[PDB]
Structures are given as structure tokens and as C-alpha cells.
Amino acid sequence: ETFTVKMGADSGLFQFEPANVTVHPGDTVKWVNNKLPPHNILFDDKQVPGASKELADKLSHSQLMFSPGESYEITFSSDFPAGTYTYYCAPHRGAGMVGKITVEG
Numbered sequence: 001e002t003f004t005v006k007m008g009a010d011s012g013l014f015q016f017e018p019a020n021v022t023v024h025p026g027d028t029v030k031w032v033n034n035k036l037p038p039h040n041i042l043f044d045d046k047q048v049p050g051a052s053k054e055l056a057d058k059l060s061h062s063q064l065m066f067s068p069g070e071s072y073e074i075t076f077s078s079d080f081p082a083g084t085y086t087y088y089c090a091p092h093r094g095a096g097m098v099g100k101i102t103v104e105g
């Protein structure tokens, strides 16, 4: 299954919508640039399973995304450990633009 997360709330707020998603290994999370771009996707190395900067870097899309509707996807392959993965948008981190993916094995 693919789960879609909007970057920017439809109403014009600095949020991932929905904030929290639960997936199964093999599933895909697709981020779609929605409102008030740019945004990016940075995983917090302290809040991914195994507390790994390498894992967080692999998952991240650090470059800013400006075009309405453009997308970035991660498919949660077996390489990636089950557990919770917290991420944020760098330019809007203080605004509370944070989200979480729970990979349930």
C-alpha cells in the first residue's frame, strides 16, 4: 500500500498531513508538495530505529522541494528496521512541521 502525506496543510499551515502514518514493510510513503513550499524531509537520527545517522541520511530528501505537486517517496524495504521514524521540515521545524512513520513488522 502507498500512503500519501501532504507537505503543507490544505488550509495553508506548516504541517505534514497526516502527521503520523503506520506502515508495513514493503509499503511506500509518498510525500506530495501541497501548500506553502518549499519544504524538505529530514529524518531525526536520534528518533529512527538504531539511532543511525546513516539510516536517517538514506531516508531524507534534504533538498528543498518548490513545485506544487512534486513528490518524494520511500518504500520501506526489509533493509529498514521496524520501529518509529520521526522527521521534520528544516525551514519549518520551529513552526512544528514534524511527522512520524511507524513501521510495524
Ligand SMILES: [Cu+2]
Residues within 6 Å of the ligand: 014, 038, 039, 040, 089, 090, 091, 092, 097
Ligand atoms: Cu516545510
Ligand SMILES: [Mg+2]
Residues within 6 Å of the ligand: 022
Ligand atoms: Mg493499525
